[PDB]
Structure formats: C-alpha cells, structure tokens
Symmetry: D2
Subunit: 478 residues, 4 copies
C-alpha cells in the first residue's frame, strides 16, 4: 500500500499544475483500479519547460560552468539516490505497468543504476581530436553539448528507457524535457524529486507528463529543442521525425520495434536454446523491443526443438505482480490484447500446428509450429506471448530469410560452432547479435536498430555521439 | 571542349532516360546551351537502386573485396581525376561560371585530396572490443549502411559529390547520385572515370534530372538506406521528411548559413580585410561558407569599411577562362534577379552603399561587387542568405554583445574570428554556435577536418574521421561462454 | 596524531620485516623521530611478489571481478580517502614539512580526483575490431600486464603512488609498492584503506625500505612485469637498466627537469609574476614541475625582476600546521646543504642576488626565499636542478632565441608560457620540447590530462587515458573462417 | 646474374665510404661465395648519420614543414618505387639470405609494399585529444614526432623488418638511422636509392651497414638518437635496452623471439592443423620469430596427429633458392646449424620417439614425439626445423603449460568449438593468437611479444604510439 507523492509537472526543480488545469488518471494494469490523477500537460507547459531548459543551458549558468568531473559527481549522486529508494521506484514501476516487483527491482532498476554510474564515468572523458593539417595551422575539434534534448518514452520500460537518454545527455552537459508515456508517468515524476535532491541546478531536467498527440507533439515540433530521443512505436517514430524535419531540423534518435530473429543451428545446446528463445519471446509478457518474433531452427533439431519449447511454456507461473513466484504478469492494455489472439487465428487460416495454448485465460503462453515466411505470424510483430517456429536447411538460407524484414533491432544465434557463430554474426543485419544468450545488455555495449528499427544508438560510448555537436576550430598562424 | 558524357550511369553502362525526355544545361557566361542530357525520373531511379542493391548483396564482387583494395580503388580513381584534371575543371567552369583557375586549383585539388584522404581510411575503419563480464566476449562492428543516395547543389557540383562519394565508398557502400539540374556535367564525367578505375558495376550510379522528380524519388525510395543532401535549408527540410515518411533512412544535411565574420579591434586589419573580402565574394558569392555578416568593432569600423571598398572595386570580373578573373557570372537568371532584389532592400532599409550596387554589363549575368555600411541586425541584407557578391558590415561594442548577436540566427555552419588576442580568439571560438570556427583565416577546409552545420545549418558532418559515422551502422556482437 | 601503521603490507596482512630490522622516519620541521617502521629487503619483496602473482592468477577473485566492480572498488577506496582525508593530510605534513593546508587541498584533492577519474576508466578500457579480409575476424584485447611495481619519491609521496595505483588497478593489475624511505607513512596508511575498501588480498602490497635494497629487488625481480618509477634521473637510469638486465619489464619513468618558464613582453605581468613565483617555490621548491629557469623578455626584464622580489620576501614561512604558512622545511639536511651549496655557486658565478640567499633560523631546516638577477645559460643555477626555493631569472631577445635556449637542456617535463598573443602562445607551445606546456598558468594538472617527460625527463605518461597504455598489453586475436 | 650497385654508407641522400676505410663481405648462404664487399661503418659514421638526421629534423626543415598528407604521398611514392624494382629487391634478398626467390617476391616484398601503403594512410590521421577540464581552460594533446629513430634489424627478414619500422616512423615525421644485419645489408642499401628517388629530403633516412658491437652499439648508446626499434635476439635486445638506459633514456621498442605454442584441440580440422602447424615450424627453414616450437595436441587425436605430421615433412621439396619448386632453402650460418642437431640428440637422452629425420643432409625436416615439458627440445627455442609434439588432457592444463614460458610472441589454436577458441584466446599470454591459421599478419593488425618476447608493437595503429611523444598543452583564460 504505497503512497504516490509526486503527480505534478516538474519544471525548474518546482512542482507545477497544468496551465490548463486538466489532469489524467493512470491505472494499475494488474488490479483494474487509479492509482491517482496526474497533471495533464500540453503545449504551454512544454513551452515553459523548454524555456526553463534553455535558461539552464545559457553560458554562465551554474550548469554550464560546472567541472566535467562534478557533472559526473552529480550523476553518481543520482545513482546513489536511486539505489536508496530503489524499492519505492520498483514498486511504483509495477503499480504503473503490472511488471513483477522482483523484475522491476532486479532488472529495471539495476539497469537504471548501472546506466547512471556508467555515464558518470564518461563526463570527464568526452574528448575531441587535434587534427594534423599544415605546419602553420592549429586545427582541433570540440564535442560540445547539443543543448535542450527531449526524451519521449514508452510504457514497457518507463524508467529504464528514460535514464538511457538522461544519463548520456546529462554527462555531455545538455538540458532536458522529459515526457513519459501517459500509461506510466509515475517513476519519471519520482526521479524528478531525486534529481532535485542530488543537487542538479534548476532547469537542467524538466518533466511534462501528458499524452502523445498533445505533449509529445509539442516537443517534437518545438522550435527551441535541439534534439529528441524517442523509444516507442515505429509509426509514432516516423511522425516525431517528420515533426522534427518540418520545424527546426532538430537531431533525432529513434529506438523502435523489430521482427527479431532467433536462429538455432543443429549443433546448439538445445536446452540453452529453448530456454533463452523462450525467455526471448515470453519475457515481460512478450511486450519488449527485444521480443523474439521468429525462431528459425535447423531440420536436424526442429521437431524435438518444438517439443522442448512446449514443455517450457507449460510450467511457467503467471499471476499477481507482487508475487515472489511470478515470471509473467498482465499485459497493460486490451487495445492490443485483441490484436494478439486476432493474430493467433491468423496462423490457423494459413497452416500452423498450434501445439500450445491459443487463447486467453493475462493470456496463455502460445507456441506455433510448421510456420512459413508468408504467414502473418511471421510477418508483423506481435507485442505478446506467441512463439512462431520456422524451419531452415542452410546457413545462407536463414541469412536471407532473417534479413528479409524492414527491421533489424536484435538477433540471437545458438551454436557451438566457431565458424557458424562468426559468419552469422557478420551476416545478420541487426544492431545487436547475441550468441548463446538473450537480452544480454550492458551499459557499456551500444544498443539500437538497423533499418526501420531506429536511428543512432543508446548505451555505450556511441551514445555520446547523439548528445554532442562537433565543432571544428581552425587557427592559422603568421 | 566537347561534352562526351550525357547519359544515365547505371551498372557502369550509359542509358537513355526511360522516358526519352532530355533537358539542357546552359553556360552562365556565354548564356548558351552546352548540351542536352537525359532527364531521369522515378523509373530511372528505381533502375539505379536495383543496380546498387545487387552490387551490395553479400558475396558480390564489391563486398568480397579487401578493405585495402577498396582503398586502392579510391586511389586509382583519384589518380584518374588528376589525369583528366583540366577536362573536369573545364566542364565545371562552363556549367558554373567558375573561374577556370579556381576550379583547377581549388575545386579539383579538394576533390583529389578528399578521395585520397578517405582512401586511407578504408582499412582503418575500426570498431571496439568492450569489457563486460568474465564469461562474455563483446565487440562492435562498423558495417556499411547499404545503398546511399547523394543529392548535391550547383555551387560546388563535383566537390560536394566527392565529399559524399569518398567516405561512402571507403566504408563499402553503393551509391545513387543525382547532380543538380543546373550542373550535371562533372558528375557524369566522373562516372566514366569510376568505370575506368575498376569499380564493379552497380557500385555507383548517377541519374541526372530535377529535384521534385529525381531527388524526390531518391529521398522516398524504400530501398535506399542513407541519404546525404547538400543544398537549401528548405529542400533540406523536405528531404528529411520524405526520408522519415518512408523507411527512416539515415540523413546527413549540409545546408546554408548566415555565417558571421567577426573582426576585433586588435586584428591584423589588412589580413581581416583581405580574408573577410574573399570570404564574401569567393565563387561569385555562391558558397555554403559565404561571409554574410561582417561584425566589426567600433574602434576599427569605419576604416575597415573603407579598406574593404578598395578591394571590391579593384577585383577583376569577366570571362571565366581568362587567367586574370576572380569573379564570374551568377549561376542563372533566377538568382541574378533574386540578389539584385535584396540589394535594393539594402537601400530601402537604409544602408549606406559604399560600393557597386548595380549590374555590370546589361547582356551578361555579372554583378559588380557591392558593399554596405551601417547595417543593423533587423535589415534584410543582415538576416537572409544573399548568396551573391554583397558585404553587409555591422558594428559591435563588446565581445559578449557580438556573441549573442552572431548566435541570434537559426544557422551555424561557419564563423570567422580575426584577432591577435589569445583569450579573445579562444573565448569566441568556444561560444560561437557554428560547425567550423576559423581564426585569422577564412575558407580553410581540410579533408581531415570535419565540416557541417549547427542548428538548422545541417545534421552530421562531412570530411574527417567523423564522416565515417555517417556511412556505417554500428552492430554489437555479444557472446556468452559456457 | 599517533601513527597507527608501521608494517609491511602483504595479502592485506601486516608483517614485521623478515630481518627484524626497522628504520626511522623523521619530521623536517620538528627535526624529531615520528616512529620506526619495518625495513624490508629482497626476502620481503620476494614475499610480496608471490602474493601479487597469486592474486593475478586466472580464476582468482581479483580476475573474475567485473570491469565495473573494479571501478566500484576504486570509488570505494576514494570514498575512504575522503573520509580519513585529514589523517592522511596530517601524516603527509609530518613526514614532508608540507603545509597542512597544501596537503589537504592539493595533494589529497589530487589523490581523490585521480582515484575517481580512473575508476570510470575500468569498464571503458576498449580494444579494436580491425578490418582485414572477407573471411577473417581480427580484433585486439587490452589485457592487464600483471604484477606492476611502483617506486615513488618523497616530494609528493601519496600523490605519486596513487598516480600509478589508480590506472594500474583499474586495468586489473596487482601491485608491489615501495614508498620512499623518507616518507613511508602515507603509503602504509593507504594500505589500511585498501583492505577496508574490499580489495582482495594480494592485489596491492607495500614494502617500505631503501632504494639499493628494496627498490633494487623490485626493479630486478624476474616476476614483476611492469615498473613505474618517479624520482631522480640517475636512479631512473639505474631502474631501467635493472629492468632491462632481468626480464625486460615495461618501464614508465617520471624524472626531473630544468623546466623553463617563459614570460613575454605582452604578458599579464602581475599574473606572470605570481604564477612564475609559486611555480618556483611551491612545495618548498621540491617539485617535479619546479620553475627552474625564468626567461623574461628584455622589455619587461628588470621590473619583472623587481616585482618578483617583493612576492618572495612577503611569503610566509614557518610551522607546517599553522594555517598561514606557505613554505616549510626542506626534506632532510642532505638537501638543505645541497641547495645552499648551489646558492653559493650563484654568487660565485656572478648573479646579482636580489633577495634572500641564506638560511632562516639556525636550528631548523628552513631557507628564506632567494632570487637571482642577470643569470645566463652557463651558470650553475641555470643548468642543474636545484629543487629548493631559488628563482634564477634570465633575459631573452627573440622568441626563436628563447625556443633554442629552453630546448638546450637534456630535460623536458614541463614548460610555462605567459603572453596574450595568440600566435606567440601557439608558436611557443608547438616548439617547446616539454611534456606539458602551460600557458598563462602554472602547475595546472588534471586527472584527465597526461603528464610526463620528453627526452631524459621520462618515458611514458601518467594521468589521462594515455595512462592505460602503460598498464595494459595489446594482444591480437586473428580468426580465419572456413 | 644480378649486379649489386649499392654498397656504401647512405647519408644525406649521398653515398659514402667508411671514415675508417674498412669494408666487409656479405656472402650467399646457398652457394658459398661474395657477392661483394660493403662499406664497414663504425662510431664516427653513425656520428655523421645522426647529425644528418638531426639537421633534417630541425624546425624549418623541408621535412618538418611538409603537409601531413604529402608525408604520406612520399610513402606512397616509395611503395610505388618498391613495386617497380620488386624483382630486383626480391633477388637481392635471396642472394643475401638463401630465401626462395618466390618467397621473397610474394611474401617479403608484398609485406613491404602493403606496410608502406598502410602507414601512408595514417600520416594525416595521427590525432591527439581535446580534453574537458574546467570551463575557463583549454587543454589538448599533440602527438608530436619523437625525433631521430634508430632501426636495428636481423637477417631472417631483412627488408621487411626494416620497413616495419621505417613506415610508421616516417609517417609520424621522424628521421632515421638504419643499421641492417651484417649478414644481409643489401636490400637495405637498395632502398636508400629508392628513398632518394622518391624525393625524401636528404637526412630523413640514413643507413650505416656494419657489425653489431660496433655500429649497432654506436646507435644504442648515441646521446642524440631519441628512440630505437630493434628486432633480433633476446640477449642483444637486453644489451640495446641497457645501452639506451645508461645513455640518454631513449625510447626502446623490442621484437625478440619466443617458445611459440601451437594447441590442437580434439575437434580440430586435423588436416588444417597439421598443415599450418607444419608451415608454422618449418617455414623459412624454421628461422622465424613466429616459429612454432611447441605443438600441444589433445589425447583424442595425438597419435594420428603425429602420423599426419610425419607424412607432410616427407613430401616437402628442398633445394636451390632460385627454384620454382622450392619451399625450404639453406640456413644462413653454421654457427647454429651445429646447435640444432646438438639439440636433436637433446631429446633422445631425455626420451622422445623420433619418428622423423634427425640429422643433416640444408637439413632434413625432423619430427619428435612423446615430448614432455622438462625436455630441452620443449625448453629453449630451436631456430630450425624441429617439431616437438606434446600431449595434453585439459583446456586448463594446456593453458598453464603454454604460459609457463618467459616469452609470448605468438600462439595458434585449432578447434571448431566457439567456446574453446575464445577461452583459449583470452587465456594465452601471447601478443598474437591465431585461430585455425598461422603466420596471418596484416599491416593493420599489431604485432609484438608479451613478457620477454619484446616491448611495444609494430604494424597497426598501435605502431604509431612508439613513434610519437605526447605533449599536453593547457591554456587558462582570463
Ligand atoms: N492501429 C494499429 O494497428 C496498431 C498496432 C500496434 C500498436 N498500435 C498502438 O501503438 C501504441 C504503442 O504505445 P507505446 O507508448 O508503447 O509506443 P508509441 O511508439 O505509440 O509512443 C510512445 C511514446 O511516444 C508518445 N507519443 C504518442 N504519439 C506521439 C506523437 N504524435 N508525438 C510525440 N509523442 C507521441 C507517447 O505519449 C509515448 O510516450 C499502442 O498503444 C497501440 O494503440 C496500433
Ligand atoms: N651463444 C648462444 O648460445 C646463442 C644462441 C642463439 C643465438 N646466438 C647468436 O645470436 C645471433 C642472432 O643473430 P641475428 O642478427 O638474427 O639476431 P641478434 O638478436 O643477435 O641481432 C640482430 C641485429 O642486431 C645487431 N647487433 C648485434 N649486437 C648488437 C649490439 N651490442 N648492439 C646493437 N646491435 C647489435 C646485429 O648487427 C643485427 O643487425 C646468432 O647469430 C647467434 O650467433 C647465440
Ligand atoms: Cl562550400 C566551400 C568549398 C570550398 C572552399 C574552399 C576554398 C578555398 C580552398 N579550399 C580547399 C578546399 C578543400 C576541400 C576539401 C578538401 C581539401 C581542400 N576547399 C576550399 C570553401 C567553401
């Protein structure tokens, strides 16, 4: 029975009610019910947050004058603060999303805590180049901060996807306007308290909760935001990018979805393959940017693979989020709950042996078989617990079949063969290629999509590129 | 000079436009028609992208190549450009009004240097090996992006194409290039050389034609993975939106600017004047980096103004090929009147016209060099990109004043600062919001040094190791050991 | 303050010297004995290296650690140093004669900052993935070197130990440290903190004792893989030779210098004087970076000379702990006479002694600040490293003159340049043969910025990403696919 | 029947006879006989070369004022020149060394040509850092050239080991004093003609042929050489480093020998293993820094491995160097020819089944078996064609056995297992670890020894570190 203390617009380290007066409700996907009502922001609110962020970015600001090292100190402060109150946040995260509490505690917030500390290390190590040119010339580059950055996040990993942006952005010295999902604003607002407590100057991070077409679009078009980062649907990603282009040509980072392939070679540890490929599709209830939507399996192990797959889905406990016995919780919205089983009869019309589940109970873990490429279950991403298992003959074959999507966020390969591992790794068009593991993410390893799965990267030194503008200084001597 | 090349370049073959239509390119000095080249359209673009896709398919000759052999191919191309250095330089002038010696020693030097710089980057495109857990091996590969599209302007037709082609090819991509309608000759000549140098067919394809027509088919193509566009801010906005609405292709942008040139009291005044001067009027004022806003400190304001006027008047104008010219015709009459329109806004808003102000010879597209006096921030000549021979000079009191006044624009491509004061030079360099900040020089570009815009002057960078990031896709391989 | 720690630190345990011998450390101001600590010898060193080898064996707790957890351990250590910040600062002063506020705000700030800087480098020590052939996967790993040895001087006992310990530990090495005989207290205190912070036993071991005895056993040890030595040029020569004659251990060297401080005519003269002044006399003149040769342009020579004399005389000297002191005792009497000997060479070779020249109070080891006048290149005070409070000021005509005259030494650790002229500052910075070149500042060290010697002033660098190269071994993995 | 045109000391692009007047003879290891007599340099000659090199390094020199890019132009010129006259050089190389002519042509000179072109690319891409520090400070690093560098080379790969130093050193803008081996000075002197022809300013590269204790020691102690690079014996490497330390503390790079292990896992392609492990020990007549001195093989394939090993040695053609039918030529000096078979009875006293060869004929390819760690054939490096084959049980086992040497230049592993490849790679203490190949060197991949096999690296961007001195510039503003 947790009290929600932060419900307002966070601007200049002060709590605000919407200039409109409107508010909206977030509810608990597990136990249909509100938790509470949140200030509903809109264009004028973001106009205020932006101005706050520009003033904090002005030359001579307490933010801009700081030591590079103190900038990372502050980020270490925040990670400290997030470690204290870690349970508070993990709890809010589950009330907002129906995630298992243990999942929020040991995944979502470990991720936040490592990501914050990692980029704290980077703040005084952001370095440009001194460039050789002519004898009488001194030419060098500066990696300056971009300015006001906007973060727009989904509901599946609200706080994590938020600190994946904030951490690099702040370590590089930018200021920010954050807009959480409507469905899950709570952890984001809590972080604002922590951001004030740890001592970030007012205006460095402001937060405007609200809806997409209102607040998010107010950000994506704002003429004095210099960059956006967005994690969300592919289609909304296109709009955000079009918005940016029409307005002020702000720099855009995008992390979207994908038809993420999982390739099982005949020589694979099959018990590791089935277990990871199971955790790959069904983890966080199948709602995950990294979700495995296409399990390719070689003939030699196909049929037995299908069997092992099915026994694993059977045994998986599902129930109330607070449960120390849970893996899978509730999906967050029946908007797509219908789309899922709508797409489960998809693969009975075209022919697929459903050896498992096939309907709601939450929803029963479902497993398909004898799936082919043309079928829709192997065509459009599911956003839910369904395992479409396909058959392949050749290495070259599955390479073209995996790459035949317009996306390419992740890919996972299972084999003990050195040449099979490496040739597949080189050949798959995916931003991350895991080998004999799944959902192995590290603050120090970059993450992002090829093709229509996104632009740019989060998580690694490559993250810093999205949050810096390269300046060339060229000096001629007499 | 007779124009050998006038066709669509696909798979190292020359093709008549699928429509059969053709369009003409004209000479801004002779005001006459050089020739007719094939006018491409969406079907032609579709034909080139399929070539470039097939050229980038795994196993193709182009992908199985060594890293170093790619580098060697760029060197062989740069060799050839050096050979036919005078042909290209000629074609460029005919179609630009560029002084032939400017094309030979600036444009084409830059081309051969860029090609050679990035030739050496090929076998040094390196990713990372990243520490993680005891039992995990984690590294990144910098894969090529795929089919890249280049859309270039007329101000520096060949140079702006190379700037893209060199790093793109060095990273192992394939290309679909559209030169400007006004200036297609250099691009298609290069295509001859691209074949001769040994590049596999399909690696580089070229479809001349118009922006609404071929450019739009390239920006929206669902199978082009990356677009690089130099040109207007407006068409730049449109290009990024098409890229967005379609398949989210990565976008590089090099647009214009209202580039400040700030002269402090303690400047070499004669250097400031000379560099600021050719900074304005170089390449007939038609340049990305054109000096648009000469801020001068009050101490030296007036006799800076005087000293510039004399440079302007004595500056040779005439036939491009004549060895003594420094400024030639404007590109087309569409521009010629547009600048003259803005000159008249300078008078109409009240700037003392210290020089020029008119057109030179009624028949031609030339303009005599023009200078203005006590220009302020609000006037037209001080906020709109003129892109002609016009030197609008302003006055400032304090360095903090001029900082805020230079950064008050929506642009930020280049900036110059003249002073001898170490703290001033560096304080200014830190705080001016511009992609390149020259200091006691102007137009000092190197293939090693990145170039590109802050704010609405661009996205990304061309020319330096930073250019490889625009032509590669980061991939993370992460292996867990048993 | 009572000294808690006086023993050999091996495997996180305290050990009496295998011989049983002990030696004493004395206070340069009180001229009294602080305490007795164990005098180590080869057997003790042999004991510590075996600990450090076992700590570095694959599978050991220390090697199975995460990269980030190593970083976290360095942060936990830096936390602890901040806690017992006044204890350490005290121990340092007692054993140094350092003004206690100098130790607190300079030494220990630098220590905590360095520890924290390199804590963040741990999970960002990255190798390369290298393009080669279509069928080959080629990458480099930056493995740790192994057991590293650190040998440090007395001028900055704790700081110079950390400078090595932070990057070495961050890269995952194990360590055998020998503090100077004169100044062992800070080092062994740290060892307490090293245990408390959670470092596995054996990762860091400390054997106090003498150079001919413990230092020599470390430099020659066949199982130490890397040696880092700050100290004299001569002992530096000997250390590298022992490293050579034995097992070719990698060698970092930070030695002394005859560091030029060049003041141009157009300098902030008051800044030049103040910074050049504390550049000489800081830390009682006993500093790697000590200003040894003040070149001044003739235009400002004489009343530069005057303006410095007044700073010298009004500079407080006295008890280290007294809050108003700036300069304390020299380290031992071995030095006290050595500087006084060279002062008398200044008179004997003819320099006008504008200030000081004597010793302050007969009982103590203090010296009043001393300044010389029309010093030339050939004199003793202008070619030998004084390492005390002595400001030898020279005169120069041209910048090219002073370039050749500053680079005429065998050293090149640091150099300062004061001017407001952009070209002068940069021309000088380019051409002075020194590891660090300050400009309108002095003693401006950052944990992010590399430090170390040109020529005979050192090998390698401490403090910046460049420091990781001294503590890692590059390995190339090259896989051919079938 | 080739004429040797260059026999003198090369200083300031001019040909010189030794100030002493002494000369020495190089002879042809294949056909006992001189080729000719070479100017024999000594201390005063190097004193002249050094001064030449310092003057060419002075500020304002045509060398120092050059564009970074033109510096690489020149290196491209030299590689061009070496490609022309490639046959001339390959020929001199074989007259000097007894290498097969085809081996000199397609290995030694391809290596030289690629190495030169690779570092030509690097000259205008040597970049320092702009370092974040305080707001009012500008701090950046310059990677300046070190100055006069000395290269000292052996006889096994005279020209290649020489351009492995010259190429990085010149691209970074240093000047050089080269001392080839006494046994093989000829290609080095030829390169001097090419260095003049291609347009390098006088004094940038000078060459002083001569003996080790005379000329090499004159370099290693010279008070105005700022760095040495040395490839040669371990013991001479120690002396050079001691010399450097006693004199002026010049920067030293060392490439020495090694007891280079070759590890065959049970799952290995055995035909690739035996063939590479055969080419690994017997190539260039067993005289090679990369020579395989220790072949560890897992029980599961040991005995059959030994068999296959022996049949390969049988069939290998050996004869006159000029032969289009050759693999192996003559060893260059009977100084160690005796040491080899001296060490072949080594392993009969301690017990080793000699299934192959065992004596001179050149010398017969020899193969040992049932070798153990203690035996001297598995203890000291051979410098000749002998294959000591050992047996191992475990992965952990062979890891400690491989690493139990004081050296660590290279190591080669054969397995199709992904986990076995990677764990071995991480665990072996060697500067290069090849997997399913041998002697796979690339101008772009760094090369060098762990432990007593050397300091520093040649060949890769890491090469540039040895040829640059980091300068920190730190500027405080008012
Ligand atoms: N109609 C279909 O066939 C279909 C299919 C799949 C998903 N969807 C919808 O996509 C939604 C995904 O929700 P999500 O939050 O996880 O991902 P998302 O990709 O839709 O948006 C995530 C974030 O961006 C915000 N946003 C929404 N519109 C915006 C806009 N114009 N400008 C700026 N920001 C905007 C949102 O407030 C949220 O914070 C689902 O809820 C579903 O209704 C529809
Ligand atoms: N006595 C033994 O047990 C034993 C064992 C193995 C090898 N060796 C000897 O080592 C030699 C290896 O010859 P190599 O040229 O291939 O390798 P090397 O490691 O001996 O020397 C190679 C290069 O360094 C030069 N050099 C020699 N002495 C020098 C010195 N003091 N200072 C500077 N340079 C010096 C040489 O002129 C040559 O150019 C063999 O010829 C052999 O006689 C002896
Ligand atoms: Cl948009 C624009 C185009 C060209 C110049 C320009 C002016 C004068 C000299 N140059 C040299 C180069 C150059 C370009 C790329 C590589 C190497 C050199 N470029 C220039 C200036 C602005």
């Amino acid at each position: 029975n947790l009290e929600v203390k932060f419900t307002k617009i966070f601007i200049n380290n002060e709590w605000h009610e919407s200039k409109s007066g409107k508010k909206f409700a977030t509810c608990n996907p597990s136990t249909r019910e509100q938790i509470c009502e949140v200030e509903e922001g809109d264009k004028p609110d973001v106009d205020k947050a932006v101005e706050a962020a520009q003033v904090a970015f002005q030359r001579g600001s307490p933010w801009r004058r700081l030591d590079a090292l103190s900038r990372g100190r502050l980020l270490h402060q925040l990670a400290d603060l997030v470690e204290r109150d870690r349970a508070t946040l993990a709890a809010l995260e589950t009330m907002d999303t129906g995630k298992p509490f243990l999942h929020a505690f040991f995944i979502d917030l470990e991720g936040c805590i490592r990501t914050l500390r990692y980029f704290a290390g980077w703040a005084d190590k952001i370095q440009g180049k001194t460039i050789p040119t002519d004898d009488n010339v001194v030419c060098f580059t500066r990696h300056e901060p971009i300015g006001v950055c906007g973060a727009i996040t989904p509901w599946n990993f609200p706080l994590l996807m938020l600190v994946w942006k904030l951490a690099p952005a702040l370590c590089c010295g930018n200021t920010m306007v954050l807009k959480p999902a409507e469905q899950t604003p709570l952890t984001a607002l809590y972080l604002g308290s922590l951001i004030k407590e740890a001592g970030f100057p007012p205006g460095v991070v402001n937060i405007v909760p609200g809806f997409g077409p209102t607040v998010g679009a107010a950000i994506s078009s704002h003429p004095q935001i210099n960059k956006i980062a967005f994690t969300g649907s592919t289609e909304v990603g296109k709009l955000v990018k079009e918005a940016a282009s029409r307005s002020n040509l702000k720099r855009v980072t995008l992390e979207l979805g994908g038809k993420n392939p999982c390739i099982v070679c005949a020589d694979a540890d099959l018990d590791l393959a089935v277990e990871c490929a199971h955790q790959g599709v069904f983890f966080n209830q199948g709602q995950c940017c990294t979700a495995a939507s296409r399990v390719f399996v070689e003939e030699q192990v196909y049929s037995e693979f299908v069997r092992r797959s099915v026994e694993y889905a059977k045994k998986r406990p599902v129930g109330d989020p607070f449960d120390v016995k849970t893996e899978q919780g509730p999906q967050i919205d029946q908007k797509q709950f219908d789309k899922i089983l709508e797409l489960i009869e998809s693969g009975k019309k075209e022919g697929a042996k459903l050896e498992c589940g096939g309907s709601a109970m939450f929803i029963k873990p479902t497993v398909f078989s004898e799936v082919t490429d043309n079928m829709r279950i192997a065509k459009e991403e599911i956003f839910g617990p369904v395992q479409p298992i396909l058959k392949f003959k050749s290495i070259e074959e599955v390479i073209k079949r995996a790459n035949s999507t317009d996306y390419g966020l992740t890919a996972a390969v299972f084999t003990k063969n050195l040449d099979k591992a490496l040739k597949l790794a080189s050949a798959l068009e995916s931003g991350t290629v895991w080998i004999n593991c799944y959902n192995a993410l590290y603050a120090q390893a970059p993450f992002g999509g090829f093709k229509m799965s996104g632009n740019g990267r989060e998580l690694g030194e490559y993250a810093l590129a999205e949050y810096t503008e390269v300046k060339t200084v060229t000096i001629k001597l007499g």
